[PDB]
Design a protein around this nucleic acid. Structure first.
Ligand SMILES: [K+]
Ligand SMILES: [K+]
Ligand SMILES: [K+]
Ligand SMILES: [K+]
Ligand SMILES: [K+]
Ligand SMILES: [K+]
Ligand SMILES: [K+]
Ligand SMILES: [Mg+2]
Ligand SMILES: [Mg+2]
Ligand SMILES: [Mg+2]
Ligand SMILES: [Mg+2]
Ligand SMILES: [Mg+2]
Ligand SMILES: [Mg+2]
Ligand SMILES: [Mg+2]
Ligand SMILES: [Mg+2]
Ligand SMILES: [Mg+2]
Ligand SMILES: [Mg+2]
Ligand SMILES: [Mg+2]
Ligand SMILES: [Mg+2]
Ligand SMILES: [Mg+2]
Ligand SMILES: [Mg+2]
Ligand SMILES: [Mg+2]
Ligand SMILES: [Mg+2]
Ligand SMILES: [Mg+2]
Ligand SMILES: [Mg+2]
Ligand SMILES: [Mg+2]
Ligand SMILES: [Mg+2]
Ligand SMILES: [Mg+2]
Ligand SMILES: [Mg+2]
Ligand SMILES: [Mg+2]
Ligand SMILES: [Mg+2]
Ligand SMILES: [Mg+2]
Ligand SMILES: [Mg+2]
Ligand SMILES: [Mg+2]
Ligand SMILES: [Mg+2]
Ligand SMILES: [Mg+2]
Ligand SMILES: [Mg+2]
Lengths: 99, 203, 141, 50, 200
RNA sequence: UCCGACUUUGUGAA
RNA sequence: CGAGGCGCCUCAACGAGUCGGGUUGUUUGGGAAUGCAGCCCAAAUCGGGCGGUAGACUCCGUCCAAGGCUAAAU
RNA sequence: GCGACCCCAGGUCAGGCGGGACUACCCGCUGAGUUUAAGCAUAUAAAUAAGCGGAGGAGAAGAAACUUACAAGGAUUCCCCUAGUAACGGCGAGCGAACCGGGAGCAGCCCAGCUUGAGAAUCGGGCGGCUGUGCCGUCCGAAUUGUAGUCUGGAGAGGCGU
């Protein structure tokens, strides 16, 4: 949303072309829980339960070992970014169960 | 629409429900031949996305293939060559197990044509796939404009030329741009293009 | 062309110009650049110092177009000004990018006449030479 | 047996000439057609050409 | 190797002689391509032989920043601003590229203008004797409708050369163009350290 | 060929 | 002789033992790992895959895999 | 005992499909060594020869989980250039592409998922008729563990008007 300073070197370093706002595209909504897919996923979760590695994460979070939970999720899922997301879901399941 | 519920359940393979149901099925497949015709897909929702329809002309087979790597089949583990080529045991087949299963089915059923296959089970020594095949001589297939293409002669034995979904996986066609440009049109076509000595008439 | 080759002048002469003692054999000395550190070391050291070893850092996926900076010297700037524009000249203003140039360098003498130069880049001496002639520089992109 | 150096198809058959040099040659061959002595030297019978 | 030569690097250690590509079919390829162009021209008699209309784009990368060329097709936003439905555009000789986007206004306007110039030159034949359709042309316009060859709408590569005559003011001088280039480079390389100190 | 880990691999008692 | 286009305004579903990670082998110009394969682990939906040096954090650019067909230039 | 289904068995049952051949080009697997390194083991020969399969008049690929870093481009294929370059390599011998740019030629589509329930609206076969590569009628069957139609992210559904 910012035009460049026309200098060929520096922070912006480019030709000035009076930029415009890009319109929304359908693919902007990818990976977005809409409805009725969360419902189906949530219903299957209570029918199926939790994987044993997910339970091991949950018991680690109950005793406050949040760093040990991240290392177990990293071992299982293989990626730090996925481990962070999986721990957050595990914490929310405890948070929802808290009420 | 119940297909989403079925699909979501099959994503939880480690639940008590799926583990029990898969364990009983895995036992029963072990008492059957390695190539068995079934009257109905076990995973109908997974079959819909891969092209299966509940019509006369679509048939489903369960194929059992052995797990593990590819030992070099030389008479005593003896190689006559340089030590770079002396390995025997820890080598790997270049095609996946899914393509091996549908290639066995194609050889057994020459009158049919493989659509694709999906994973079904495994224990330790066997992997199970269900392969969808089409009877391209049936009028229901010949009159359906969405499956008519399979009746044309250029699609004969596509499982043997690496043209199914499993074949595109091991051919390196499940990615684009750099990291995959050497696989198009094929790796051998790419290699031949780079070996050419172009001797123009005005050089 | 075969008629002018020296092999045609050596017909009837036994060894074809290769000697009776040190004959023409297949590969005495090896093939290609063989032995460049063992029996061809003097040749490699004398005519190609620098050949072996590793200096500098690697650049994975080094695209040439990133380093594309064509340059032009001040001594050539006035050839881009047409005759009728110089007669009218106030100073002509030349955008060297319209002639395929990025940076202006300062080799050679400018005439003692003002000129305005538009460029993405310029050296310090080229700028000093342009200002000494009564001209100016405008930085563009 | 087999020929010593068997003739291959990737010999250089066609030859490149600079476009400018080709135009110079044509202009030089065009001007030679106007002096009658060089035409006779080529064997043309032009004794009765006006 | 015996004298002061270059170090030889001949890539001829494989079976290169089974992969020699000669070009003795080059004049035959030229005739086959010419013949198909004439057959294609007769197959579409009034339609232009140069294909559908193309937009104007900047070549990417810093080496070719300043050159314009033909793109693949017009954006969905350009067609909407010119009034041409995206389903109609391919059928009347306009290329559509749903992948491309419009990030700057000037690139977009020049392409919209290009479509308007094309629409003033396009002559549409009714799909029947009755001209019940709206976009069709008058009988006079159809009565003289020939086939154009080559590029009916050329693309200009690069900004046209133009040496202007200007008065050099006192602010045009003493601008210190080299100093500006160096200070802006410094501001770039000092940005991370400046932001670190600012956070602390 | 021996040897260890994982997989095949489930259930309940102290 | 109804449907589509266009102007305006609340839902919007998109492919799983698959992706991805580890390791082993092979292959590549791809170098803390280019593709592929076996085995082990094993996903997500304010998400996922890339930006040619492994890592964490903050921004930015860019795409949407795991179903299918497709002339021409060769 | 009469029944409904599931799984399976046997048929010289009615109608159909497959196997082999060819090698120039094309698709898949499998896979050396001679050779070079003036020795040789990694490397090279070569992801080649041989070996086992699969097609067509072309094949394969193909419509971005692509590039880039630009004022950004926009499916596949082929040519020129990139370029003997980045990289790789007892960093030895050697090896070695891609992006941009210019050409040839250009074209984008179909599904699954929620989406008949005021009516499986879909399909095949037997028989009969005809205007006959098909259409209609009737009777059986397939199919609800889903045929048809709508929809495919560039969207789309729904609502309101040309
Ligand atoms: K000699
Ligand atoms: K020399
Ligand atoms: K040729
Ligand atoms: K969808
Ligand atoms: K690897
Ligand atoms: K992202
Ligand atoms: K009937
Ligand atoms: Mg002698
Ligand atoms: Mg000698
Ligand atoms: Mg001697
Ligand atoms: Mg060789
Ligand atoms: Mg692996
Ligand atoms: Mg490895
Ligand atoms: Mg191999
Ligand atoms: Mg980077
Ligand atoms: Mg997908
Ligand atoms: Mg697809
Ligand atoms: Mg295809
Ligand atoms: Mg042709
Ligand atoms: Mg019979
Ligand atoms: Mg055959
Ligand atoms: Mg040797
Ligand atoms: Mg020797
Ligand atoms: Mg030896
Ligand atoms: Mg062979
Ligand atoms: Mg034939
Ligand atoms: Mg094809
Ligand atoms: Mg798309
Ligand atoms: Mg490209
Ligand atoms: Mg060069
Ligand atoms: Mg090589
Ligand atoms: Mg290429
Ligand atoms: Mg280009
Ligand atoms: Mg049935
Ligand atoms: Mg439906
Ligand atoms: Mg609709
Ligand atoms: Mg509407």
């Amino acid at each position: 949303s910012q035009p460049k300073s026309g200098l060929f070197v520096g922070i912006n370093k480019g030709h000035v072309v009076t930029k415009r706002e890009l319109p929304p595209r359908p693919s902007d909504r990818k990976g977005k829980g809409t409805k009725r897919v969360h419902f189906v996923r949530n219903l299957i979760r209570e029918v199926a339960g939790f994987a044993p590695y997910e339970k091991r994460i949950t018991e680690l979070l109950k005793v406050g070992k949040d760093k040990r939970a991240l290392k177990v999720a990293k071992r299982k899922l293989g990626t730090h970014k996925r481990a962070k997301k999986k721990r957050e879901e595990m914490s929310s399941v405890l948070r929802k169960m808290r009420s | 629409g119940a297909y989403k519920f079925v699909s979501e359940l099959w994503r939880r393979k480690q639940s008590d429900v799926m583990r029990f149901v898969q364990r009983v099925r895995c036992w029963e497949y072990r008492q059957q031949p390695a190539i068995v015709r079934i009257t109905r897909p076990t995973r109908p929702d997974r079959a819909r996305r891969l092209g299966f329809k509940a019509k006369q002309g679509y048939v489903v087979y369960r194929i059992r293939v052995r797990r593990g790597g590819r030992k070099r089949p030389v008479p005593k583990g003896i190689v006559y060559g340089k030590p770079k080529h002396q390995g025997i045991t820890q080598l790997k087949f270049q095609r996946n197990k899914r393509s091996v299963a549908e290639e066995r089915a194609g050889r057994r059923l020459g009158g049919l044509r493989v659509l694709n296959s999906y994973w079904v089970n495994e224990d330790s020594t066997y992997k199970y796939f269900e392969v969808i095949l089409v009877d391209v001589a049936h009028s229901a297939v010949r009159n359906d404009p969405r499956i008519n293409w399979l009746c044309k002669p250029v699609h004969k034995h596509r499982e043997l030329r690496g043209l199914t979904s499993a074949g595109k996986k091991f051919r390196g066609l499940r990615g684009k741009g750099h990291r995959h440009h050497k696989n198009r049109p094929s790796r051998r076509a790419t290699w031949k293009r780079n070996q050419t000595v172009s001797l123009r008439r005005y050089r | 062309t075969t008629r002018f080759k020296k092999n045609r002048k050596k017909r009837g002469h036994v060894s074809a110009g290769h000697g009776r003692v040190g004959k023409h054999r297949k590969h005495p000395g090896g093939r290609g650049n063989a032995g460049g550190m063992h029996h061809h070391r003097i040749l490699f050291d004398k005519y190609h110092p620098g050949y072996f070893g590793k200096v500098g850092m690697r650049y994975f996926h080094k695209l040439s177009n990133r380093f594309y900076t064509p340059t032009v010297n001040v001594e050539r700037l006035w050839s881009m000004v047409p005759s009728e524009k110089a007669a009218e000249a106030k100073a002509p203003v030349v955008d060297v990018s319209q002639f395929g140039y990025f940076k202006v360098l300062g080799k050679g003498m400018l005439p003692e006449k003002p000129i305005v130069v538009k460029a993405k880049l310029i050296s310090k001496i080229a700028e000093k030479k342009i200002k000494a002639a009564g001209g100016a520089v405008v930085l563009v992109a | 047996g087999r020929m010593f150096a068997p003739t291959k198809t990737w010999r250089k058959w066609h030859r490149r000439v600079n476009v400018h040099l080709r135009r110079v040659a044509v202009a030089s061959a065009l001007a030679a057609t106007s002096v009658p002595s060089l035409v006779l030297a080529r064997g043309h019978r032009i004794e009765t050409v006006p | 190797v015996k004298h002061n030569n270059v170090i030889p690097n001949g890539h001829f250690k494989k079976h290169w002689q089974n992969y020699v590509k000669t070009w003795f079919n080059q004049p035959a390829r030229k005739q086959r391509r010419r013949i198909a162009r004439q057959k294609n021209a007769v197959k579409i008699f009034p339609r232009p032989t140069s294909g559908p209309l193309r937009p104007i784009v900047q070549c990417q990368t810093r080496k070719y920043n300043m050159k314009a060329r033909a793109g693949r097709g017009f954006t969905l936003e350009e067609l909407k601003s010119a009034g041409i439905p995206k389903k109609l555009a391919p059928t009347i000789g306009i290329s559509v590229d749903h992948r491309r986007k419009n990030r700057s206004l000037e690139g977009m306007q020049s392409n919209i203008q290009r479509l308007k110039t094309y629409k003033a030159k396009l002559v549409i034949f009714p799909r029947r004797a009755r001209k019940v359709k709206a976009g069709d042309s008058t009988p006079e316009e159809l009565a003289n409708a020939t086939q154009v060859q080559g590029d009916y709408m050329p693309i200009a590569r690069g900004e046209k050369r133009s040496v202007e005559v200007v008065k050099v003011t006192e602010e045009m001088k003493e601008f210190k163009a080299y100093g500006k280039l160096r200070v802006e480079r410094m501001n770039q390389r000092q940005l991370g350290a400046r932001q670190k100190k600012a956070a602390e």
